């Protein structure tokens, strides 16, 4: 069994391999996420249509449960591994407790995973950061963020990937409570966010949403573009 | 089954029957008892068929790799040692009586039995196997200190041939070795060989 | 050791896996590998590399390999390490059908092998899978599909492309020709013709170096061929006759 | 013991079961139900030794669950009865066996309604009709009497509950109510229950 | 006792270029009928089919266990599998569970892939092959079908006369046993057709 | 179940019944009991059809790899103490009784292998449930160094015994020959009992059997 | 010719050329012993002789030994690394007393040597370990090839051999045996020892005193191996 | 214990650099030859020893598998013992389970699969050899070639070793589909003296034949007849 230790400490007490792992998340596609008042939503900067790629197959928003979704930036191969555990994962929960996961409750199971793969022999980090969003059984909004160096804190709107400065940014100037006053609005300020980092805008773009106590709900390439033109 | 071993100044003399049963019906009637597991030492088996060809087997395979690595015979006293590890260890699942005589530089004509359960102690002369017990008046009451060669082989047959007469499961014909420095002298009774002794009339 | 340990799975300073871009590397140097998806069935085309006038054809094909009674895949890149990726691929649809009665869902069986070529690219100390796959199939739930998979794991699926040598000269012809949704399973042979046509450079298709699968429904069962010599051969005199009438 | 009845019609399938706990002598429960939600349009009904029941159906629910969430679409009737049938007959040789009788009910979009007899040997079987339990005894002559295949779901409320009449008339055990519930193209629809 | 639980019946039959394999429908435990159509017989090919009666769980783990190996075994080696090379294969499946096995005897009837000759055989629990000319029979009726088809096999008979011979033997023999029969499915196998046939039966 | 073998003047005669009984009933009433260890070796086996098949194909197969890497012929002696280990090392439970005979390097060799791991090097041996009968013949019979045809006649009849006086044996008597240059697997040697011939005619006239379903499924 | 790449040179892996100088520096770990061991084959016997260098008196000359008896009817005469050798001899007996317990006949002479060849090549394809600096020569009669000299070394090649030689003088052995063995083979017994001497004092250049040399050997007649004393050395020595 | 980690891995450009090296091995190992009758298949190959010291018959290179698969190799001889017994396992192996001889494919296809084991796991070289199998099975000749990269390809006639590259042209010049067996002896010898570099004796080569009657090594004197002719 290989059982070399991939991450160790340099000078200055700096553990490179989570930070390279951190620069592959940098590389990857830009996501949005926002916690609104009674709806919870995420967008994601396609990279590209390319005409004969079924949109089915590349989404970079998953469902963990019903009451729980999340999206990825970084490596695709490794956001699908930490979705399979962590659907795994939330069906153990139900099991063993007989009620749905909350958002903090699977988000610290995911970075407690990635903390493990920073700090264990034989393995890298893994090279994604995921936005976790969801409502508890009390109906309060939740969104999250994990970082490939296992830390995760709560947030009410951050963005991810390529341009997440930028992005963040721009959230921050522009996230208030009217901003937040209703649903619509609410993924209006998604989709100004994603404009201000993708360029062709509306069609490179996929937004999902999650009501109370509603299933998530994948908006329409006609609906984005509806929202797209009154946001013009 | 009966097998015997005597020791004399010089060697030893091993003998045993020629039966093996499976119930009443004699599978067997000329086997052969007397298992040599080296150049001068011999084993007497009893018991299992398989468990004693087995464990005669695996003596034989570690005593002939001890003696190859130490440039020496084997001493009687260590192929005894190697069959009681086995017995002993393996008591639970083995029924082995082994009678092991044989001749070393060290200490000349030695008999050691290793009865069930891997007990190990020299004697003068040993017996064993289903037969013996009807031979151990006879042979407490022959025995003598300083016999010859000659004379040990004579009282091997004759205690042999009682048992065999005696019991149901020993018969046939009775193999005796005679171990000593010169080498291994084999031997085969059969017949009108065999000791006898005339029944009563009433 | 620690000396000689060559370190496959770690970060570069850049935040990229060295070994999984070269294995990448190894797989534009491999024969060319197309797969067309049309509204009759799926077909893949690929081309054939051992065109050696000495070796003998006594298998089922080179290059494509049936998974299961109703899929099909071709590969491209390390022929030994596709061996060992085709006969996973099996044991996984196998063991899917014992414990569900039901043939394994075609995005199912790639998610799967791609599991396995991810953990090699994150934990083991081993070199990672130098080959990349298409795959066709069609089952009850989206009916024809056509994947393709890359060694880092990652895959999507697609309605037409291509992997292997002139992989790129490819996908841009594809991107040109092809008529989302009003393809048919003859069409999609012509296209897939012309295409190998012009990215196979310095050949002229003589019909030896294409091997071509067609994957199709008749009367509720799947059906996988491979076209014959003959069939190939038609299907390239007709190409000819095309390209002269353009003129 | 525990009583499960199931029946088939053209576009739908009807279960019951009882709704008795007991532990020794005394009905420590009498609303139990014995009826596990696999997914939107599947239901499990186990019966048999404490314990054993509760682990196995939800250990199926938490899988058949997973598989939903995994892939995007719900396992069909069959797919389920035969990876419930796997997991019981592979854990049947093993040191922790269960003893569990099932009835897995569902309604698939293509094949249409389905009813799977299962007992605790994992022999799986498809029947228009089925029971679990010594009322299985007394109430299958009734249901091969009167059943037909293009029974409608009116009818077979009534036939259920001249099954349920005869457990109490003849049956010894003391069975007052029972769930019933019912699978068709639009879900799972909880009946009234039969209660006397 | 075991293999009584469930009960259950299977025989094949060898004509001139044709076989036939037949078994009874009932499914029950014990005293108890459950269902009357399950399923015993099973195709492992074009023309290859294998009968399986005993525990009602095991003939279909047997099956299934035996269709995942036939399946690797055919996309592997690119052909169809002979019928004594599906009998090495259930055999040594069976085997592998000498201790502790599975209760059920197959009996393996079909034509060979390529010259379409007869074959049929049989096999204990523990996998011990058995290969004859005349018929094969397993079940918990296996005396009154030796009886049957001692007396009424004959040789080179046409799938036509195969049929009668075979449904005759499996309708008197399960008629004489309580835990088996409700039913008769018989497959005629030839070189071009697949005759499968459901007999009048007794269903008490 | 009769299996017997006897030492001639130039080789080995092997000889068994073929009858399988599946309880107190005839289950093959043609059975090969004479199994193929080397070419120059061979092997009755009696007790548990099973383990008897996946024995002598198992020691086969490992004598068959010995021989490819030694490049010279089995010796009877390999074969016959591979039996025994495996044997012994299960204890008893492969009720494989075995009648292991052939001729190598060192001239013919004849042994008996017990379910439990106990071998015996004898001129002549018998197994199985007719063992005791075939004894008898040989006991009463047998002469050391007896020509081949005088062997074949006593092993013929020694089968002939048990199947005569052992319900657990009948129908044919099987034969091997092995000898320094010559191997004749003699496989129905002698045929002491045939099936009486039908006096009356059973046969099913076309329509006598009644049908509910039929379907009939036309293959390429 | 001479390239390198990675870590060839210092770990069993194919340079450039596929070469394998790991397994090359190993043959090269033989010379390192100063001997030098020949072995000969006749109608009826084989032979090993070797040099014995007693550095000091103060060593027990009984135990500076490279003759090993390997079974009664097996001898091997071991050039290179002296620990080496005694764990390959060791490994050897092992070898020879499993083959015996298992087929019930004594190990062949070729089967000994193919095993400890194959053992050898593990040591090649697998990085961990390195392979021993020894080279093996073994004697034996055939119950029916007659004599048999087989030879082994580190990289896992071995081969029969009517005569051979290990060592610093390998290649002038062979070169003189090369000779002999183009004329006659008749090769009595007193020939083959008589041969193997008169070689090995032709490439040392020296005449070796009684105590100078061991030999070991093994004849039809006798089969077991046997080390001849030094009065049995001092009669073949005054002789030739 | 052991190491754990890949010895072949990716160059920049792609390539394992491992097996290209293993393939210069095999290069420059000894000539083979192997020519697929029209009834049956014949493995020639060159064996010349560098002194008469050496006992030519004590180990040979055309090696039996099976009753039915001969096995030559051209470039070092451990590994091809290695692989030879690891090939003979895997015959029985099938045979045990399916009770019949195994195809000359399947044989190739499992000794292929651990060649790439080799190639691919921890702390291990690949092995430095390349395998030619012939076989006969449902009555038809099969030939094979067997890379230490575990990949195979099936050959009507192929050369290996030293000099490969002018020997397969001459083959190809050579070759014709409808051959018997004896004439392909005579092209498979002649191949070999195209680059053989002395005088040829039935000890210097060896030659094995495949056909319906089974696979069998030819003897010395049979090889006499045949370079006589
Ligand atoms: C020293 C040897 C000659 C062994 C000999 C001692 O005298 N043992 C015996 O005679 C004992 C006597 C018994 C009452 C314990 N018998 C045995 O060991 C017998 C001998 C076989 C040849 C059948 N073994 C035995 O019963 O197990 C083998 C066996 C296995 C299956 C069926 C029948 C027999
Ligand atoms: C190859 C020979 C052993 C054939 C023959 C000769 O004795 N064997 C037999 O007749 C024995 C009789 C038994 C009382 C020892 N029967 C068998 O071996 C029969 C198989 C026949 C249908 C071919 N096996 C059988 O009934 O299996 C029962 C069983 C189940 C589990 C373990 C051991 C035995």
Same mark, same amino acid.
């Given at each position: 069994?290989?059982?070399?230790?991939?991450?160790?400490?340099?000078?200055?007490?700096?553990?490179?391999?989570?930070?390279?792992?951190?620069?592959?998340?940098?590389?990857?596609?830009?996501?949005?996420?926002?916690?609104?008042?009674?709806?919870?939503?995420?967008?994601?900067?396609?990279?590209?249509?390319?005409?004969?790629?079924?949109?089915?197959?590349?989404?970079?928003?998953?469902?963990?449960?019903?009451?729980?979704?999340?999206?990825?930036?970084?490596?695709?191969?490794?956001?699908?591994?930490?979705?399979?555990?962590?659907?795994?994962?939330?069906?153990?929960?139900?099991?063993?407790?007989?009620?749905?996961?909350?958002?903090?409750?699977?988000?610290?199971?995911?970075?407690?995973?990635?903390?493990?793969?920073?700090?264990?022999?034989?393995?890298?980090?893994?090279?994604?950061?995921?936005?976790?969003?969801?409502?508890?059984?009390?109906?309060?909004?939740?969104?999250?963020?994990?970082?490939?160096?296992?830390?995760?804190?709560?947030?009410?709107?951050?963005?991810?990937?390529?341009?997440?400065?930028?992005?963040?940014?721009?959230?921050?100037?522009?996230?208030?409570?009217?901003?937040?006053?209703?649903?619509?609005?609410?993924?209006?300020?998604?989709?100004?966010?994603?404009?201000?980092?993708?360029?062709?805008?509306?069609?490179?773009?996929?937004?999902?949403?999650?009501?109370?106590?509603?299933?998530?709900?994948?908006?329409?390439?006609?609906?984005?573009?509806?929202?797209?033109?009154?946001?013009? | 089954?009966?097998?015997?071993?005597?020791?004399?100044?010089?060697?030893?003399?091993?003998?045993?029957?020629?039966?093996?049963?499976?119930?009443?019906?004699?599978?067997?009637?000329?086997?052969?008892?007397?298992?040599?597991?080296?150049?001068?030492?011999?084993?007497?088996?009893?018991?299992?068929?398989?468990?004693?060809?087995?464990?005669?087997?695996?003596?034989?395979?570690?005593?002939?790799?001890?003696?190859?690595?130490?440039?020496?015979?084997?001493?009687?006293?260590?192929?005894?040692?190697?069959?009681?590890?086995?017995?002993?260890?393996?008591?639970?699942?083995?029924?082995?009586?082994?009678?092991?005589?044989?001749?070393?530089?060290?200490?000349?004509?030695?008999?050691?039995?290793?009865?069930?359960?891997?007990?190990?102690?020299?004697?003068?002369?040993?017996?064993?196997?289903?037969?013996?017990?009807?031979?151990?008046?006879?042979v407490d009451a022959t025995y003598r200190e300083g016999m010859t060669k000659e004379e040990c082989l004579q009282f091997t047959a004759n205690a042999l041939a009682l048992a065999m007469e005696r019991d149901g499961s020993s018969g046939g014909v009775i193999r005796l070795a005679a171990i000593?420095?010169?080498?291994?002298?084999?031997?085969?009774?059969?017949?009108?060989?065999?000791?006898?002794?005339?029944?009563?009339?009433? | 050791?620690?000396?000689?340990?060559?370190?496959?799975?770690?970060?570069?300073?850049?935040?990229?896996?060295?070994?999984?871009?070269?294995?990448?590397?190894?797989?534009?140097?491999?024969?060319?590998?197309?797969?067309?998806?049309?509204?009759?069935?799926?077909?893949?085309?690929?081309?054939?590399?051992?065109?050696?006038?000495?070796?003998?054809?006594?298998?089922?094909?080179?290059?494509?390999?049936?998974?299961?009674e109703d899929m099909a895949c071709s590969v491209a890149g390390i022929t030994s390490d596709a061996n060992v990726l085709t006969n996973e691929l099996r044991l996984i649809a196998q063991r899917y059908l014992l414990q569900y009665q039901e043939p394994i869902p075609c995005e199912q069986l790639?998610?799967?092998?791609?599991?396995?070529?991810?953990?090699?690219?994150?934990?083991?100390?081993?070199?990672?899978?130098?080959?990349?796959?298409?795959?066709?199939?069609?089952?009850?739930?989206?009916?024809?599909?056509?994947?393709?998979?890359?060694?880092?794991?990652?895959?999507?699926?697609?309605?037409?492309?291509?992997?292997?040598?002139?992989?790129?000269?490819?996908?841009?012809?594809?991107?040109?020709?092809?008529?989302?949704?009003?393809?048919?399973?003859?069409? &999609?042979?012509?296209? &897939?013709?012309?295409?190998?046509?012009?990215?196979?450079?310095?050949?002229?298709?003589?019909?030896?170096?294409?091997?071509?699968?067609?994957?199709?429904?008749?009367?509720?069962?799947?059906?996988?061929?491979?076209?014959?010599?003959?069939?190939?051969?038609?299907?390239?005199?007709?190409?000819?006759?095309?390209?002269?009438?353009?003129? | 013991?525990?009583?499960?009845?199931?029946?088939?019609?053209?576009?739908?399938?009807?279960?019951?079961?009882?709704?008795?706990?007991?532990? !020794?002598?005394?009905?420590?429960?009498?609303?139990?139900?014995?009826?596990?939600?696999?997914?939107?349009?599947?239901?499990?009904?186990?019966?048999?030794?404490?314990?054993?029941?509760?682990?196995?159906?939800?250990?199926?629910?938490?899988?058949?669950?997973?598989?939903?969430?995994?892939?995007?679409?719900?396992?069909?009737?069959?797919?389920?009865? !035969?990876?419930?049938?796997?997991?019981?007959?592979?854990?049947?040789?093993?040191?922790?066996?269960?003893?569990? !009788?099932?009835?897995?009910?569902?309604?698939?979009?293509?094949?249409?309604?389905?009813?799977?007899?299962?007992?605790?040997?994992?022999?799986?079987?498809?029947?228009?009709?089925?029971?679990?339990?010594?009322?299985?005894?007394?109430?299958?002559?009734?249901?091969?009497?009167?059943?037909?295949?293009?029974?409608?779901?009116?009818?077979?409320?009534?036939?259920?509950?001249?099954?349920?009449?005869?457990?109490?008339?003849?049956?010894?055990?003391?069975?007052?109510?029972?769930?019933?519930?019912?699978?068709?193209?639009?879900?799972?629809?909880?009946?009234?229950?039969?209660?006397? | 006792?075991?293999?009584?639980?469930?009960?259950?019946?299977?025989?094949?039959?060898?004509?001139?270029?044709?076989?036939?394999?037949?078994?009874?429908?009932?499914?029950?435990?014990?005293?108890?009928?459950?269902?009357?159509?399950?399923?015993?017989?099973?195709?492992?090919?074009?023309?290859?089919?294998?009968?399986?009666?005993?525990?009602?769980?095991?003939?279909?783990?047997?099956?299934?266990?035996?269709?995942?190996?036939?399946?690797?075994?055919?996309?592997?080696?690119?052909?169809?599998?002979?019928? =004594?090379?599906?009998?090495?294969?259930?055999?040594?499946?069976?085997?592998?569970?000498?201790?502790?096995? =599975?209760?059920?005897?197959?009996?393996?009837?079909?034509?060979?892939?390529?010259?379409?000759?007869?074959?049929?055989?049989?096999?204990?629990?523990?996998?011990?092959?058995?290969?004859?000319?005349?018929?094969?029979?397993?079940?918990?009726?296996?005396?009154?079908?030796?009886?049957?088809?001692?007396?009424?096999?004959?040789?080179?008979?046409?799938?036509?006369?195969?049929?009668?011979?075979?449904?005759?033997?499996?309708?008197?023999?399960?008629?004489?046993?309580?835990?088996?029969?409700?039913?008769?499915?018989?497959?005629?196998?030839?070189?071009?057709?697949?005759?499968?046939?459901?007999?009048?039966?007794?269903?008490? | 179940?009769?299996?017997?073998?006897?030492?001639?003047?130039?080789?080995?005669?092997?000889?068994?019944?073929?009858?399988?009984?599946?309880?107190?009933?005839?289950?093959?009433?043609?059975?090969?009991?004479?199994?193929?260890?080397?070419?120059?070796?061979?092997?009755?086996?009696?007790?548990?059809?099973?383990?008897?098949?996946?024995?002598?194909?198992?020691?086969?197969?490992?004598?068959?790899?010995?021989?490819?890497?030694?490049?010279?012929?089995?010796?009877?002696?390999?074969?016959?103490?591979?039996?025994?280990?495996?044997?012994?090392?299960?204890?008893?439970?492969?009720?494989?009784?075995?009648?292991?005979?052939?001729?190598?390097?060192?001239?013919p060799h004849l042994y008996s292998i017990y379910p439990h791991g106990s071998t015996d090097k004898l001129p002549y041996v018998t197994m199985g449930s007719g063992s005791l009968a075939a004894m008898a013949v040989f006991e009463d019979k047998f002469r050391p160094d007896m020509e081949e045809?005088?062997?074949?006649?006593?092993?013929?009849?020694?089968?002939?015994?048990?199947?005569?006086?052992?319900?657990?044996?009948?129908?044919?008597?099987?034969?091997?020959?092995?000898?320094?240059?010559?191997?004749?697997?003699?496989?129905?040697?002698?045929?002491?009992?045939?099936?009486?011939?039908?006096?009356?005619?059973?046969?099913?006239?076309?329509?006598?059997?009644?049908?509910?379903?039929?379907?009939?499924?036309?293959?390429? | 010719?001479?390239?390198?790449?990675?870590?060839?040179?210092?770990?069993?892996?194919?340079?450039?050329?596929? $070469?394998?100088?790991?397994?090359?520096? %190993?043959?090269?770990?033989?010379?390192?012993?100063?001997?030098?061991?020949?072995?000969?084959?006749?109608?009826?016997? %084989?032979?090993?002789?070797?040099?014995?260098?007693?550095?000091?008196?103060?060593?027990?000359?009984?135990?500076?030994?490279?003759?090993?008896?390997?079974?009664?009817?097996?001898?091997?005469?071991?050039?290179?690394?002296?620990?080496?050798?005694?764990?390959?001899?060791?490994?050897?007996?092992?070898?020879?007393?499993?083959?015996?317990?298992?087929?019930?006949?004594?190990?062949?002479?070729?089967?000994?040597?193919? $095993?400890? %060849?194959?053992?050898?090549?593990?040591?090649?394809?697998?990085?961990?370990? $390195?392979?021993?600096?020894?080279?093996?020569?073994?004697?034996?009669?055939?119950?029916?090839?007659?004599?048999?000299?087989?030879?082994?070394?580190?990289?896992?090649?071995?081969?029969?051999?009517?005569?051979?030689?290990?060592?610093?003088?390998?290649?002038?052995?062979?070169?003189?045996?090369?000779?002999?063995?183009?004329?006659?083979?008749?090769?009595?017994?007193?020939?083959?020892?008589?041969?193997?001497?008169?070689?090995?004092?032709?490439?040392?250049?020296?005449?070796?005193?009684?105590?100078?040399?061991?030999?070991?050997?093994?004849?039809?007649?006798?089969?077991?191996?046997?080390?001849?004393?030094?009065?049995?050395?001092?009669?073949?020595?005054?002789?030739? | 214990?052991?190491?754990?980690?890949?010895?072949?891995?990716?160059?920049?450009?792609?390539?394992?650099?491992?097996?290209?090296?293993?393939?210069?091995?095999?290069?420059?190992?000894?000539?083979?030859?192997?020519?697929?009758?029209?009834?049956?298949?014949?493995?020639?190959?060159?064996?010349?020893?560098?002194?008469?010291?050496?006992?030519?018959?004590?180990?040979?290179?055309?090696?039996?598998?099976?009753?039915?698969?001969?096995?030559?190799?051209?470039?070092?001889?451990?590994?091809?013992?290695?692989?030879?017994?690891?090939?003979?396992?895997?015959?029985?192996?099938?045979?045990?389970?399916?009770?019949?001889?195994?195809?000359?494919?399947?044989?190739?296809?499992?000794?292929?699969?651990?060649?790439?084991?080799?190639?691919?796991?921890?702390?291990?070289?690949?092995?430095?050899?390349?395998?030619?199998?012939?076989?006969?099975?449902?009555?038809?000749?099969?030939?094979?070639?067997?890379?230490?990269?575990?990949?195979?390809?099936?050959?009507?006639?192929?050369?290996?070793?030293?000099?490969?590259?002018?020997?397969?042209?001459?083959?190809?010049?050579?070759?014709?589909?409808?051959?018997?067996?004896?004439?392909?002896?005579?092209?498979?010898?002649?191949?070999?003296?195209?680059?053989?570099?002395?005088?040829?004796?039935?000890?210097?080569?060896?030659?094995?034949?495949?056909?319906?009657?089974?696979?069998?090594?030819?003897?010395?004197?049979?090889?006499?007849?045949?370079?006589?002719?």
């Amino acid at each position: 069994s290989y059982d070399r230790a991939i991450t160790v400490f340099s000078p200055d007490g700096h553990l490179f391999q989570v930070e390279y792992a951190q620069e592959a998340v940098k590389k990857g596609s830009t996501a949005v996420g926002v916690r609104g008042r009674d709806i919870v939503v995420l967008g994601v900067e396609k990279k590209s249509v390319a005409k004969l790629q079924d949109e089915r197959t590349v989404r970079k928003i998953c469902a963990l449960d019903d009451n729980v979704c999340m999206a990825f930036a970084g490596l695709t191969a490794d956001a699908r591994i930490v979705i399979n555990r962590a659907r795994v994962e939330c069906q153990s929960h139900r099991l063993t407790v007989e009620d749905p996961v909350t958002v903090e409750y699977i988000t610290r199971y995911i970075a407690s995973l990635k903390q493990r793969y920073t700090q264990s022999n034989g393995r890298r980090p893994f090279g994604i950061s995921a936005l976790i969003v969801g409502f508890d059984f009390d109906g309060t909004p939740r969104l999250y963020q994990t970082d490939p160096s296992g830390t995760y804190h709560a947030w009410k709107a951050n963005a991810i990937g390529r341009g997440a400065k930028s992005v963040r940014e721009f959230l921050e100037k522009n996230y208030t409570d009217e901003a937040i006053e209703t649903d619509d609005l609410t993924i209006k300020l998604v989709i100004k966010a994603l404009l201000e980092v993708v360029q062709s805008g509306g069609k490179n773009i996929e937004l999902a949403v999650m009501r109370r106590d509603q299933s998530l709900k994948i908006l329409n390439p006609e609906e984005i573009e509806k929202y797209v033109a009154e946001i013009e | 089954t009966t097998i015997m071993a005597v020791q004399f100044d010089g060697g030893v003399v091993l003998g045993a029957d020629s039966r093996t049963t499976t119930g009443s019906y004699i599978a067997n009637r000329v086997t052969d008892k007397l298992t040599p597991i080296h150049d001068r030492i011999f084993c007497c088996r009893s018991g299992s068929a398989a468990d004693t060809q087995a464990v005669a087997d695996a003596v034989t395979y570690q005593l002939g790799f001890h003696s190859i690595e130490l440039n020496e015979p084997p001493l009687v006293h260590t192929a005894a040692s190697l069959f009681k590890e086995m017995c002993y260890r393996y008591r639970e699942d083995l029924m082995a009586g082994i009678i092991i005589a044989g001749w070393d530089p060290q200490e000349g004509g030695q008999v050691y039995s290793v009865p069930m359960g891997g007990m190990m102690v020299r004697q003068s002369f040993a017996i064993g196997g289903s037969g013996s017990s009807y031979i151990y008046g006879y042979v407490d009451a022959t025995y003598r200190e300083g016999m010859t060669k000659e004379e040990c082989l004579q009282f091997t047959a004759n205690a042999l041939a009682l048992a065999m007469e005696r019991d149901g499961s020993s018969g046939g014909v009775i193999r005796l070795a005679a171990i000593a420095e010169s080498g291994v002298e084999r031997q085969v009774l059969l017949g009108d060989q065999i000791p006898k002794f005339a029944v009563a009339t009433l | 050791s620690r000396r000689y340990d060559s370190r496959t799975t770690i970060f570069s300073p850049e935040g990229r896996l060295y070994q999984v871009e070269y294995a990448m590397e190894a797989i534009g140097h491999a024969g060319t590998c197309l797969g067309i998806l049309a509204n009759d069935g799926v077909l893949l085309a690929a081309e054939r590399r051992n065109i050696h006038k000495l070796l003998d054809e006594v298998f089922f094909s080179e290059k494509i390999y049936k998974l299961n009674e109703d899929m099909a895949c071709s590969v491209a890149g390390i022929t030994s390490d596709a061996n060992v990726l085709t006969n996973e691929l099996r044991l996984i649809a196998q063991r899917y059908l014992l414990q569900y009665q039901e043939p394994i869902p075609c995005e199912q069986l790639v998610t799967a092998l791609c599991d396995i070529k991810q953990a090699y690219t994150q934990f083991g100390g081993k070199r990672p899978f130098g080959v990349s796959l298409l795959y066709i199939g069609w089952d009850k739930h989206y009916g024809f599909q056509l994947y393709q998979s890359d060694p880092s794991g990652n895959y999507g699926g697609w309605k037409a492309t291509c992997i292997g040598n002139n992989s790129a000269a490819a996908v841009s012809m594809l991107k040109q020709d092809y008529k989302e949704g009003e393809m048919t399973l003859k069409s &999609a042979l012509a296209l &897939a013709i012309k295409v190998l046509n012009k990215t196979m450079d310095v050949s002229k298709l003589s019909a030896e170096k294409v091997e071509i699968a067609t994957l199709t429904r008749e009367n509720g069962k799947t059906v996988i061929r491979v076209l014959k010599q003959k069939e190939v051969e038609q299907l390239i005199k007709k190409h000819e006759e095309e390209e002269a009438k353009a003129e | 013991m525990e009583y499960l009845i199931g029946i088939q019609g053209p576009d739908y399938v009807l279960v019951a079961s009882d709704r008795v706990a007991a532990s !020794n002598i005394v009905q420590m429960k009498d609303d139990h139900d014995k009826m596990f939600k696999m997914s939107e349009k599947i239901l499990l009904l186990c019966v048999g030794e404490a314990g054993d029941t509760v682990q196995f159906a939800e250990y199926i629910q938490k899988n058949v669950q997973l598989y939903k969430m995994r892939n995007g679409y719900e396992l069909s009737p069959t797919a389920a009865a !035969n990876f419930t049938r796997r997991n019981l007959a592979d854990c049947l040789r093993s040191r922790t066996p269960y003893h569990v !009788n099932l009835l897995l009910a569902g309604y698939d979009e293509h094949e249409g309604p389905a009813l799977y007899y299962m007992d605790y040997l994992a022999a799986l079987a498809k029947a228009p009709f089925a029971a679990h339990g010594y009322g299985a005894f007394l109430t299958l002559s009734i249901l091969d009497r009167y059943y037909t295949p293009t029974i409608s779901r009116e009818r077979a409320v009534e036939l259920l509950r001249k099954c349920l009449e005869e457990l109490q008339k003849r049956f010894i055990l003391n069975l007052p109510t029972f769930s019933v519930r019912i699978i068709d193209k639009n879900g799972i629809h909880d009946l009234d229950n039969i209660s006397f | 006792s075991i293999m009584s639980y469930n009960g259950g019946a299977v025989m094949a039959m060898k004509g001139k270029n044709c076989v036939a394999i037949a078994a009874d429908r009932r499914f029950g435990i014990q005293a108890q009928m459950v269902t009357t159509d399950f399923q015993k017989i099973f195709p492992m090919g074009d023309r290859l089919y294998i009968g399986l009666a005993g525990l009602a769980t095991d003939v279909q783990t047997v099956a299934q266990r035996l269709k995942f190996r036939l399946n690797l075994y055919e996309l592997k080696e690119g052909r169809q599998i002979k019928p =004594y090379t599906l009998m090495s294969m259930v055999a040594n499946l069976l085997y592998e569970k000498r201790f502790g096995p =599975y209760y059920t005897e197959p009996v393996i009837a079909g034509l060979d892939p390529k010259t379409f000759k007869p074959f049929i055989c049989s096999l204990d629990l523990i996998g011990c092959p058995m290969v004859t000319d005349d018929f094969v029979v397993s079940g918990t009726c296996a005396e009154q079908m030796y009886g049957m088809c001692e007396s009424l096999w004959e040789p080179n008979m046409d799938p036509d006369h195969l049929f009668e011979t075979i449904s005759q033997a499996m309708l008197n023999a399960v008629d004489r046993d309580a835990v088996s029969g409700m039913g008769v499915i018989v497959h005629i196998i030839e070189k071009d057709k697949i005759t499968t046939r459901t007999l009048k039966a007794r269903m008490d | 179940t009769t299996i017997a073998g006897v030492v001639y003047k130039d080789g080995i005669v092997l000889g068994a019944d073929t009858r399988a009984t599946e309880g107190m009933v005839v289950a093959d009433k043609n059975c090969s009991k004479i199994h193929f260890i080397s070419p120059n070796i061979y092997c009755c086996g009696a007790g548990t059809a099973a383990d008897t098949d996946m024995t002598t194909q198992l020691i086969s197969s490992n004598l068959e790899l010995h021989s490819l890497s030694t490049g010279r012929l089995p010796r009877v002696v390999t074969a016959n103490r591979m039996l025994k280990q495996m044997l012994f090392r299960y204890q008893g439970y492969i009720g494989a009784a075995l009648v292991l005979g052939g001729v190598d390097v060192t001239g013919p060799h004849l042994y008996s292998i017990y379910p439990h791991g106990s071998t015996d090097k004898l001129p002549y041996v018998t197994m199985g449930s007719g063992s005791l009968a075939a004894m008898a013949v040989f006991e009463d019979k047998f002469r050391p160094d007896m020509e081949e045809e005088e062997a074949k006649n006593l092993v013929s009849e020694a089968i002939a015994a048990g199947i005569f006086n052992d319900l657990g044996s009948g129908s044919n008597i099987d034969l091997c020959v092995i000898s320094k240059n010559k191997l004749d697997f003699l496989r129905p040697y002698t045929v002491p009992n045939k099936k009486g011939t039908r006096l009356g005619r059973y046969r099913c006239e076309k329509g006598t059997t009644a049908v509910l379903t039929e379907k009939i499924t036309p293959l390429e | 010719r001479g390239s390198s790449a990675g870590f060839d040179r210092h770990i069993t892996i194919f340079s450039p050329e596929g $070469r394998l100088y790991q397994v090359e520096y %190993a043959f090269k770990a033989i010379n390192q012993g100063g001997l030098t061991s020949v072995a000969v084959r006749g109608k009826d016997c %084989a032979v090993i002789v070797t040099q014995k260098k007693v550095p000091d008196k103060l060593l027990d000359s009984s135990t500076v030994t490279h003759l090993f008896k390997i079974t009664e009817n097996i001898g091997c005469v071991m050039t290179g690394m002296t620990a080496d050798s005694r764990s390959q001899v060791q490994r050897a007996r092992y070898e020879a007393a499993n083959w015996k317990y298992k087929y019930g006949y004594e190990i062949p002479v070729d089967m000994l040597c193919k $095993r400890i %060849a194959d053992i050898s090549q593990v040591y090649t394809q697998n990085a961990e370990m $390195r392979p021993l600096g020894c080279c093996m020569i073994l004697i034996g009669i055939d119950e029916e090839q007659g004599p048999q000299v087989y030879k082994c070394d580190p990289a896992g090649y071995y081969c029969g051999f009517k005569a051979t030689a290990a060592g610093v003088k390998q290649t002038e052995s062979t070169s003189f045996l090369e000779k002999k063995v183009k004329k006659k083979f008749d090769w009595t017994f007193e020939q083959t020892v008589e041969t193997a001497i008169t070689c090995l004092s032709t490439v040392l250049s020296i005449d070796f005193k009684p105590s100078e040399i061991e030999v070991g050997v093994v004849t039809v007649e006798n089969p077991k191996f046997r080390i001849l004393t030094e009065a049995e050395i001092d009669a073949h020595l005054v002789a030739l | 214990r052991g190491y754990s980690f890949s010895l072949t891995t990716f160059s920049p450009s792609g390539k394992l650099v491992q097996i290209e090296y293993a393939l210069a091995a095999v290069a420059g190992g000894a000539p083979s030859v192997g020519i697929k009758a029209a009834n049956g298949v014949v493995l020639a190959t060159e064996k010349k020893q560098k002194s008469i010291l050496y006992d030519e018959r004590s180990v040979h290179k055309v090696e039996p598998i099976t009753k039915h698969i001969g096995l030559v190799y051209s470039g070092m001889g451990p590994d091809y013992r290695v692989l030879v017994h690891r090939a003979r396992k895997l015959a029985q192996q099938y045979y045990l389970v399916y009770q019949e001889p195994i195809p000359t494919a399947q044989l190739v296809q499992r000794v292929a699969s651990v060649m790439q084991e080799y190639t691919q796991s921890g702390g291990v070289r690949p092995f430095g050899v390349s395998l030619l199998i012939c076989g006969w099975n449902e009555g038809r000749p099969y030939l094979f070639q067997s890379d230490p990269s575990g990949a195979y390809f099936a050959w009507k006639a192929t050369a290996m070793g030293k000099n490969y590259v002018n020997g397969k042209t001459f083959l190809e010049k050579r070759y014709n589909e409808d051959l018997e067996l004896e004439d392909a002896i005579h092209t498979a010898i002649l191949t070999l003296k195209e680059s053989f570099e002395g005088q040829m004796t039935e000890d210097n080569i060896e030659v094995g034949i495949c056909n319906e009657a089974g696979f069998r090594r030819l003897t010395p004197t049979e090889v006499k007849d045949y370079l006589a002719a």
